[PDB]
Amino acid sequence: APKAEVLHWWTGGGEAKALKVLQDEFAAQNGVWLDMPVSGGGGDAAMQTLKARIVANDAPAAAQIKGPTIQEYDEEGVVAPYNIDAVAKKEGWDNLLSKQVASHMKCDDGKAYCAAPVNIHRIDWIWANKKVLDSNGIKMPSTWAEFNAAADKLQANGIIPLAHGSQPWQDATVFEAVALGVGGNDFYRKAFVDLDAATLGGSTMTKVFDQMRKLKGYTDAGSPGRDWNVATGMVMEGKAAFQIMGDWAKGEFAANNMAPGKDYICAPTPSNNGYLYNVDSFIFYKVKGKDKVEGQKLLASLMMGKNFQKVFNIYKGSIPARLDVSMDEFDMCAKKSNADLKTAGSKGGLLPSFAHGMALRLAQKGAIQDVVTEHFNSNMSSSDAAKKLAAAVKASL
Numbered sequence: 001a002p003k004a005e006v007l008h009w010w011t012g013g014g015e016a017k018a019l020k021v022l023q024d025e026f027a028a029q030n031g032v033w034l035d036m037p038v039s040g041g042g043g044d045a046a047m048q049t050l051k052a053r054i055v056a057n058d059a060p061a062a063a064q065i066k067g068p069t070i071q072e073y074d075e076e077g078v079v080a081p082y083n084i085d086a087v088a089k090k091e092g093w094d095n096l097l098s099k100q101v102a103s104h105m106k107c108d109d110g111k112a113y114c115a116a117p118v119n120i121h122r123i124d125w126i127w128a129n130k131k132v133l134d135s136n137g138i139k140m141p142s143t144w145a146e147f148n149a150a151a152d153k154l155q156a157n158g159i160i161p162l163a164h165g166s167q168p169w170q171d172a173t174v175f176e177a178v179a180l181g182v183g184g185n186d187f188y189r190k191a192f193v194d195l196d197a198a199t200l201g202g203s204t205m206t207k208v209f210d211q212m213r214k215l216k217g218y219t220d221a222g223s224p225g226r227d228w229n230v231a232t233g234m235v236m237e238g239k240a241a242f243q244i245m246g247d248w249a250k251g252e253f254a255a256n257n258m259a260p261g262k263d264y265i266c267a268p269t270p271s272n273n274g275y276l277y278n279v280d281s282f283i284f285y286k287v288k289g290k291d292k293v294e295g296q297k298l299l300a301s302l303m304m305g306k307n308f309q310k311v312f313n314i315y316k317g318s319i320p321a322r323l324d325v326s327m328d329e330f331d332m333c334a335k336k337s338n339a340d341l342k343t344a345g346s347k348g349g350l351l352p353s354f355a356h357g358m359a360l361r362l363a364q365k366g367a368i369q370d371v372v373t374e375h376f377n378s379n380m381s382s383s384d385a386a387k388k389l390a391a392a393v394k395a396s397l
């Protein structure tokens with residue numbers, strides 16, 4: 001009987017509802033799922049539990065993982081042999097995924113698939129409670145200046161403008177979206193892809209921290225330590241106007257029967273045809289036993305299934321990684337995501353989220369998040385923040 005231990009951080013809400021599609025498909029194929037959930041938004045907690053399980057030679061069969069962390073484990077030598085690469089080849093994953101997604105999924109210097117992608121999340125979203133914006137005569141903002149004007153108006157009317165939880169990854173999520181709009185595509189690429197010292201520490205970055213300082217004043221006293229899905233719930237219930245968060249938030253809206261255009265408004269954060277992508281993927285470790293290897297090969301195949309990725313993503317709030325899945329049954333926000341992905345692609349605006357593990361190894365992600373969260377939760381000047389950011393990145397290299 002095919003078996004797999006699966007380590008992930010999808011422990012409630014729209015996340016669990018989407019995961020259930022995969023768990024149900026696996027059991028239907030007589031697969032035995034050993035659940036290994038590790039609660040913690042953005043997966044930093046999962047990454048700590050995973051790391052300790054590997055260093056202890058107790059690798060799970062499959063683990064939720066992002067981008068360069070895949071290759072980091074590969075370089076450890078804990079992944080090969082690449083038993084799922086045979087699945088990938090037979091099914092022609094190379095013609096079903098974008099060059100960029102495909103490259104993320106490979107081990108052995110780009111030669112063998114060792115992880116399966118299920119989706120593409122987008123980071124650069126604003127979610128708004130529609131009755132709140134209508135009640136206050138506010139149009140969904142398209143610029144930070146429109147957002148700040150709207151936030152002042154809502155605050156003066158006694159409404160929390162921005163529902164947010166201040167945890168390091170969650171502060172970084174807002175930050176990266178802000179950076180893309182305040183600085184632009186090349187700036188974002190230079191800072192978080194190239195790690196250009198001048199760009200990190202310079203005047204455009206200062207302006208990013210200026211906008212972070214504004215956003216802090218729009219949050220509420222319960223923010224520190226708050227989980228992201230609590231913040232989404234605040235918008236859902238009209239206890240706050242806005243949330244700036246990836247489209248896993250749309251998993252919550254959908255799971256509570258709210259619809260874009262009727263109960264809430266989804267609009268990208270300001271950018272110049274930018275798109276910040278995030279691919280949930282599962283790596284398959286070197287594991288002992290033929291039943292576990294059959295588990296891995298079965299999971300890989302299911303995760304890349306055509307119908308699966310349609311259904312999973314409708315619930316999850318993301319769009320399919322698979323290039324040939326019909327977007328037709330998806331909502332307005334997912335279609336905007338798909339469209340903007342194609343549009344950003346051609347303009348050089350399609351960029352990896354760093355806060356969600358696609359741009360950078362965890363060491364570089366950690367270094368940045370820690371400075372961002374320190375600025376956000378203190379009275380640090382924007383200049384000082386940018387100087388500290390550049391230095392922490394530099395020291396992390």
Ligand SMILES: OC[C@H]1O[C@@H](O)[C@H](O)[C@@H](O)[C@H]1O
Pocket residue numbers: 009010015040041042043121228248278279280356
């Ligand atoms: O925890 C909130 C989100 O964290 C992301 O990094 C992950 O890719 C999403 O699937 C969702 O789980």
